[PDB]
């Protein structure tokens, strides 16, 4: 979920993804309209 | 007692301006509990219902009519006035003038939405 | 808007006879219609209200009945005073409009 | 890098909505109830519950 | 070019600060910043849109907000961001702004109204640009060394990446009801209403014209707006208009990458 290789594919021209990231939906806020979630950050940059 | 008395020639040439102004006796158009309004009676034909006004300058008129009729208010004369513009040969008729109160009833019993205080009205001449 | 009729157009009875006349709404009006009386050269008078209560003041020989969308006019006996037009008027969604009345004449 | 995509919510009045399976890669659905939003006129609908 | 923005529409949405520590509605919003960039260029994303009028003539020097419940125009003038320190604009289309800023860990916009009124809003963020090489340094040198280096192109042509537009939802509004002395009275200034009471009769409908309602008291009815002619984004700060959305197009997302050197 957090290190190098969440996001994987073959070929860059190719369409076929796998993902291992988490997401949490939560509940939304009184008196507002938005949606509100929980996502661990992308790997890629943490590499570098 | 509020009693109703008008005031206005009732000789107008076609196609200009009828105006009828009712005068009110032993009263005040500053209430706010009742209504205004102007009634006419064709020759062989009931009374006809124009619309209301109210103190404040709220205004709802008949559908027919509300292209060309327009009321105000005078609250210093203590009067309130009828305007009939592009007036027709057909215009000819008896008008009155008549009040009615309105408030928040219940139980499907009460006096509201009747007429209870009427003028004495007036025979208008459409002619040239 | 609520289309109004009344029945019948005249009115030809002697003195004490009862007088009944029916007014007749296109549309649900409920308890909201009332009676008017109209003397010649002056203007129609409340008489009757809520449909079935009296004025106050009048006298109590005059009455009204019916529901729905049929209402009736009922005087106990007619009188020489009671000689004039009469129309009813419903009171339950604007605009408000008028019957087309009735002649009453001595027989 | 990764994207992620969020279509506009549905807001149902006055009643129960629900949502089916789909294929797409990591999809998730929930339902919440007791909700009352508001826009920038006034209350979005009648229903207070 | 500019034909693809010819049946859109301005909006409003929610910001979460408004200036003075509290919430508004109001007619400029943020949506996603993008920093993909090595060489530490920003992407914005707005809910106005820059160098077309009401008529969808273009025009360098105008832009057109929503107000209530109409567009009007505003001069591009007072279009301003910052981050700490004030940011330098570099290119602009549409809802997009391309804009380089010093290091900070806030950032607002702003703009000026058609009645001399200003407006603003806040969102964290932080900020730092990458490194390039074996040293820190600050500014351009007159003498030195080329290293490989990325950046975004001021060009307005075709791209592959595009957003969609929906049709509106119902738009409610209080005012258009008034009090008078026990009934209500609705106006309407020329638009299509739905409306729906609580009261004796259940009265319900769809009017065009002006109404009256017998013994039906005010804190018992509704009211909204129904009738578009114009599309929108599907944001999601706004609700669909219907289960299932109905699409109508799309327009495409400027200024695409390139290689470059530093």
Known sequence: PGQFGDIQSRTPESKDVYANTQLVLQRPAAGTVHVPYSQAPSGFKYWL | ?128 | ?107 | ?49 | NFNVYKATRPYLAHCPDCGEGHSCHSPIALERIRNEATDGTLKIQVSLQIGIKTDDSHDWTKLRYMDSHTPADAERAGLLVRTSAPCTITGTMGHFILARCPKGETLTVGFTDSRKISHTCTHPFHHEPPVIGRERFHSRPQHGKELPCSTYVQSTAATAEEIEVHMPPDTPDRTLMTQQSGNVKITVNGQTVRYKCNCGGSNEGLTTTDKVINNCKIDQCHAAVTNHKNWQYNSPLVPRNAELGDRKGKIHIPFPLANVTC
């Open chain 3, 1 to 107: 808007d609520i289309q109004m009729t009344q029945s019948p157009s005249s009115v030809s009875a002697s003195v004490g006879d009862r007088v009944t006349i029916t007014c007749r709404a296109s549309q649900g009006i409920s308890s909201w219609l009332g009676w008017y009386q109209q003397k010649p050269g002056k203007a129609p008078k409340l008489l009757i209200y809520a449909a079935s209560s009296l004025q106050s003041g009048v006298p109590s020989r005059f009455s009204g009945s019916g529901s729905g969308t049929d209402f009736t006019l009922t005087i106990s006996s007619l009188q020489p005073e009671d000689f004039a037009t009469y129309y009813c008027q419903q009171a339950n969604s604007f605009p408000r409009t008028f019957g087309q009345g009735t002649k009453v004449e001595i027989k």
């Open chain 4, 1 to 49: 890098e990764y994207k992620t995509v969020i279509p506009s919510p549905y807001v149902k009045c006055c009643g129960t909505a629900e949502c089916k399976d789909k294929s797409l890669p990591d999809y998730s659905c929930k339902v919440f109830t007791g909700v009352y939003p508001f826009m920038w006129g006034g209350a979005y609908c009648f229903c207070d519950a």
């Open chain 2, 1 to 128: 007692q509020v009693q109703l008395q008008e005031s206005g020639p009732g000789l107008v040439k076609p196609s200009q301006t009828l105006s009828l102004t009712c005068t009110v006796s032993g009263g005040s158009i500053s209430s706010d509990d009742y209504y205004w309004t102007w009634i006419r009676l064709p020759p062989g034909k009931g009374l006809e219902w124009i619309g209301y006004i109210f103190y404040t300058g709220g205004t709802y008129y008949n559908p027919s009519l509300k292209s060309r009729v327009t009321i105000s208010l005078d609250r210093s004369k203590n009067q309130f006035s009828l305007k009939l513009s592009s007036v027709t040969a057909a215009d000819t008729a008896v008008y009155f003038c008549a009040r009615a109160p309105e408030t928040y009833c219940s139980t499907t019993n009460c006096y509201k939405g009747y007429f209870d205080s009427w003028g004495q009205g007036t025979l208008v001449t459409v002619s040239s």
